[PDB]
Design a protein around this motif. Sequence first.
Motif, short mmCIF file in Angstrom:
data_model
loop_
_atom_site.label_atom_id
_atom_site.label_comp_id
_atom_site.label_asym_id
_atom_site.label_seq_id
_atom_site.Cartn_x
_atom_site.Cartn_y
_atom_site.Cartn_z
N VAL A 213 0.80 -1.21 0.00
CA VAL A 213 0.00 0.00 0.00
C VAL A 213 0.83 1.26 0.00
CG1 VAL A 213 -1.65 1.37 1.25
CG2 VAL A 213 -1.86 -1.11 1.23
N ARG A 214 1.88 1.30 0.81
CA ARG A 214 2.68 2.51 0.87
C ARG A 214 4.10 2.28 1.41
NH1 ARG A 214 1.52 8.63 2.81
NH2 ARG A 214 -0.41 7.88 3.81
N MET A 215 5.02 3.19 1.07
CA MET A 215 6.40 3.11 1.55
C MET A 215 6.86 4.51 1.88
SD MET A 215 8.00 0.45 -1.16
CE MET A 215 9.56 0.00 -0.42
N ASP A 216 7.54 4.66 3.00
CA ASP A 216 7.99 5.97 3.41
C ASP A 216 9.09 6.44 2.51
OD1 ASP A 216 10.37 5.39 6.16
OD2 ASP A 216 10.22 4.49 4.17
N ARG A 217 9.82 5.51 1.91
CA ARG A 217 10.93 5.88 1.06
C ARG A 217 10.98 4.96 -0.14
NH1 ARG A 217 12.32 9.94 4.84
NH2 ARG A 217 10.27 10.16 3.88
N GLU A 227 17.05 1.85 6.68
CA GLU A 227 15.73 1.52 7.20
C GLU A 227 14.58 2.11 6.39
OE1 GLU A 227 14.69 1.21 11.49
OE2 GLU A 227 13.53 3.05 11.09
N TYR A 229 10.01 1.84 6.04
CA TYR A 229 8.72 1.38 6.55
C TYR A 229 7.84 1.05 5.37
CZ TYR A 229 9.51 2.93 11.38
OH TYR A 229 9.96 3.08 12.69
N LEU A 231 3.99 -0.24 4.39
CA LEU A 231 2.63 -0.48 4.86
C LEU A 231 1.97 -1.45 3.89
CD1 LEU A 231 1.72 3.15 5.96
CD2 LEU A 231 2.86 1.29 7.18
N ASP A 264 9.83 -7.34 13.65
CA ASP A 264 9.81 -6.11 12.87
C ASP A 264 8.53 -5.94 12.07
OD1 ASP A 264 12.37 -5.07 13.60
OD2 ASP A 264 13.28 -6.59 12.29
N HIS A 266 4.62 -5.13 12.25
CA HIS A 266 3.58 -4.53 13.09
C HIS A 266 2.14 -5.03 12.82
CE1 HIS A 266 2.37 -1.65 16.05
NE2 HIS A 266 1.61 -0.97 15.22
N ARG A 267 1.63 -5.85 13.72
CA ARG A 267 0.28 -6.37 13.59
C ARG A 267 -0.12 -6.82 12.18
NH1 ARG A 267 1.05 -5.65 17.91
NH2 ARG A 267 0.25 -4.44 19.69
N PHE A 269 0.20 -5.73 9.48
CA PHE A 269 -0.10 -4.67 8.54
C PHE A 269 1.04 -3.74 8.18
CE2 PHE A 269 -4.33 -5.60 7.60
CZ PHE A 269 -5.07 -5.89 8.75
N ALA A 270 2.24 -4.03 8.67
CA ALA A 270 3.38 -3.19 8.33
C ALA A 270 4.70 -3.85 8.67
CB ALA A 270 3.27 -1.85 9.04
N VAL A 272 9.08 -3.19 9.02
CA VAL A 272 10.23 -2.29 9.08
C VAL A 272 11.48 -3.13 8.76
CG1 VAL A 272 11.61 -0.79 10.55
CG2 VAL A 272 9.15 -0.81 10.80
N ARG B 182 6.52 2.61 17.56
CA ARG B 182 7.77 2.94 16.92
C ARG B 182 7.52 4.06 15.92
NH1 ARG B 182 11.29 -1.87 14.15
NH2 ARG B 182 13.25 -0.72 13.81
N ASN B 184 9.47 6.12 12.35
CA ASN B 184 10.53 6.03 11.36
C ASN B 184 11.51 7.18 11.39
OD1 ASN B 184 9.07 8.14 10.10
ND2 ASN B 184 9.86 7.44 8.11
N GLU B 195 7.59 14.60 7.28
CA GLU B 195 6.60 13.53 7.31
C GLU B 195 7.05 12.41 8.24
OE1 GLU B 195 4.62 11.48 3.74
OE2 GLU B 195 6.28 10.13 4.27
N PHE B 197 6.01 8.33 9.82
CA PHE B 197 5.24 7.12 9.79
C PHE B 197 5.26 6.71 11.26
CE2 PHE B 197 4.82 4.78 5.56
CZ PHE B 197 4.95 5.94 4.78
N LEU B 199 3.81 4.00 14.09
CA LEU B 199 3.14 2.71 14.30
C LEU B 199 2.62 2.70 15.72
CD1 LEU B 199 5.74 0.17 12.89
CD2 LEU B 199 3.94 1.39 11.65
N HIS B 229 -3.44 3.91 8.51
CA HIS B 229 -3.30 2.61 7.87
C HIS B 229 -3.73 1.48 8.80
CE1 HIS B 229 -0.28 5.07 5.54
NE2 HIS B 229 -0.99 4.54 4.56
N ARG B 230 -4.88 0.89 8.43
CA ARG B 230 -5.42 -0.28 9.12
C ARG B 230 -5.50 -0.18 10.63
NH1 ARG B 230 -6.98 -3.67 7.46
NH2 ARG B 230 -7.08 -4.59 5.36
N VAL B 232 -3.57 0.64 12.71
CA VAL B 232 -2.31 0.39 13.40
C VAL B 232 -1.15 1.29 13.00
CG1 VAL B 232 -2.92 -2.00 13.55
CG2 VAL B 232 -1.52 -1.18 11.69
N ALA B 233 -1.39 2.20 12.07
CA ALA B 233 -0.33 3.08 11.63
C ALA B 233 -0.87 4.39 11.08
CB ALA B 233 0.51 2.40 10.59
#
Lengths: 312, 275
Positions: A213-217, A227, A229, A231, A264, A266-267, A269-270, A272, B182, B184, B195, B197, B199, B229-230, B232-233
């Motif tokens: 769905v998404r990426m911070d970078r 690193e 993140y 999603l 690493d 998260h539930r 749904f994500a 790292v 956490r 980012n 920006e 992210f 969690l 996001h869902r 949880v984020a």
Amino acid sequence: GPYLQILEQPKQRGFRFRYVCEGPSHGGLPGASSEKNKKSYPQVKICNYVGPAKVIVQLVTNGKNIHLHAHSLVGKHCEDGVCTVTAGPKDMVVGFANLGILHVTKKKVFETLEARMTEACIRGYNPGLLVHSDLAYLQAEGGGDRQLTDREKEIIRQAAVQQTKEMDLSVVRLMFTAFLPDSTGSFTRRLEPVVSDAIYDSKAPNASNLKIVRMDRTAGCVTGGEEIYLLCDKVQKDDIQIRFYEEEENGGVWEGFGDFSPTDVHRQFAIVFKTPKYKDVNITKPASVFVQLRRKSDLETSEPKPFLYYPE
Amino acid sequence: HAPYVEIIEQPKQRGMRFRYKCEGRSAGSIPGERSTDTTKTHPTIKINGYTGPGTVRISLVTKDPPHRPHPHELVGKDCRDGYYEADLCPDRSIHSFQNLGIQCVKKRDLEQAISQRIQTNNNPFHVPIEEQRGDYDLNAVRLCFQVTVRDPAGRPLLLTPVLSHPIFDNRAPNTAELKICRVNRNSGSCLGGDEIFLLCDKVQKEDIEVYFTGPGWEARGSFSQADVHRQVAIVFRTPPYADPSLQAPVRVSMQLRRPSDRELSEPMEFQYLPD
DNA sequence: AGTGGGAAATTCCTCTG
DNA sequence: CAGAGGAATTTCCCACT
């Protein structure tokens, strides 16, 4: 020689099973060819046809030893788990539409399974492997409402018991069986059954849609170790991995995998992770590549997303 | 003067989740507010003004008045029919309770739940019967101590019942604990716009926000419901800080905030840096 | 309304402390 | 081992066109 042939296989992925409590009218199993505005569906054909024939389809397991599955086929043309049709015209191509796979409950597997094994022995519908090996008796001459004895029921149980433990409520397979008119009267000449591709329940964690769905970078140094993140849709931490890859010119492919531990994730749904080192850490210009999620188990992956690697 | 019950260690308000019968006997006890990761407290009371023998009963009542018996149940050592009843240790006047568990009821079997309360005559506040029929918030309950000592004449004198702070079921996002797991990035410039992210545990897009604080300064993260996001984020943008020329790192606090409850999570720590 | 999908509810399981 | 946390199963419910 007469034989059954699968024209269109079941879809395979993207169809959710439904519990009795959910009621019907939620969707029918689509053919492997399903399209945008156009919809397809499972399709078979009797070769070297025989006037009018009777065709049944049942649900069976996906294990080495094909057995009867506990879920059940529902919709019009179905009853007590087995779907029944009949192609008697000059037309030998039948299609099954609006089919639904009913998801039985774990605590109802045995009850349902057993009652499903007997109904088979009675109707004499393939107890070859499906239930008991030497219960091959009545290959169809099981007789309308012809009762069974204790020389098999005690044999059944020993089967419906051990099998209830090895059943994978996450996947099933369709088995088509055709019967032809023999010595006038009706259908008892069985044509040797055929099994379809496996069908995977979309609501199962081990078969859900993989997606990013998404990426911070979306870029990183060729050095790697940066690193990021990500999603995503539900995934399992112990069975997921991120695959970066680049297709060459010599039909070759380079690949790298995000580095991370289950902790690493998260539930579900994500994730790292830390990026992998690129092929050659000596490039001068940025090199475009792709990233994708992949499930260790099915080796099933997601649509890819472009990733830019750049110099140090 | 009449002796009284005093709560010296409130039950922690959030974090613990109500457990269903099926989850087993080993569900756990409800912890005291003052508890922590290191220290593990438990609801405790003091019957100051009396040290002799007596008996103590604990039960569950609704959060808001009238405080009527709650359908959930207390299970654990000395519990029965949904309530706890035992003798007060006669040695000390301070009593703690480390085996209290809350057992929620299947939404289904609720009608009979209010029934058992009735038929067992729990009603600590003797609320009329017509009052205990309506709906019940299945995510909020309060502990009620009905202690019983003896008067000089040697007769049993039951004290006034006391109510503790509310106890919210963690399995409900709007009544649950807020927690930033956490991030980012935790730097950003003193001009905001960066920006992030973030969690966290289950929240709700309609009822959540990122609260930035620091002496003489308060601000919020900018983000939209679609950025959640869902549950949880959350992906949001840092706000501009007080000092535009904030040369020399300045460390502020960043926390999750829920409007409806005005509840906040423990701070995360963030630094606004110059430029 | 029937689809298609999400959420909630309820149950189970894994690892910690 | 008890019991925190995470997930998997089952049920419910809500947009649509």
